[PDB]
Amino acid sequence: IDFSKPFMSLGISIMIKKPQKSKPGVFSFLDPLAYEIWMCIVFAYIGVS
Amino acid sequence: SYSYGWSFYFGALSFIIAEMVGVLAVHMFIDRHKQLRATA
Numbered sequence: 001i002d003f004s005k006p007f008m009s010l011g012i013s014i015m016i017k018k019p020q021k022s023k024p025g026v027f028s029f030l031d032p033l034a035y036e037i038w039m040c041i042v043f044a045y046i047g048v049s
Numbered sequence: 050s051y052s053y054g055w056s057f058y059f060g061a062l063s064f065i066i067a068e069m070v071g072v073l074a075v076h077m078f079i080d081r082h083k084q085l086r087a088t089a
Binding site for chain 1: 061064
């Protein structure tokens with residue numbers, strides 16, 4: 001047969017389930033301050049003292 | 050994404066060891082002077 005010019009173009013795509021928010025974590029109170037901030041706070045406490 | 054290694058932790062660990070020696074040396078200094086303030 002003789003196809004015409006494409007009236008629409010598509011391709012293989014990835015389908016997933018929409019991120020339904022996220023379950024929390026035990027030590028999730030430290031999220032605001034990064035790991036380094038917390039580490040350096042300990043070092044500054046040991047130093048000031 | 051990164052991940053600190055043992056070399057960085059030695060630097061961090063050095064601080065702690067050094068700070069502990071720092072307080073210990075101050076204690077020794079005070080102890081010497083306390084002996085002099087009791088024998089005079």
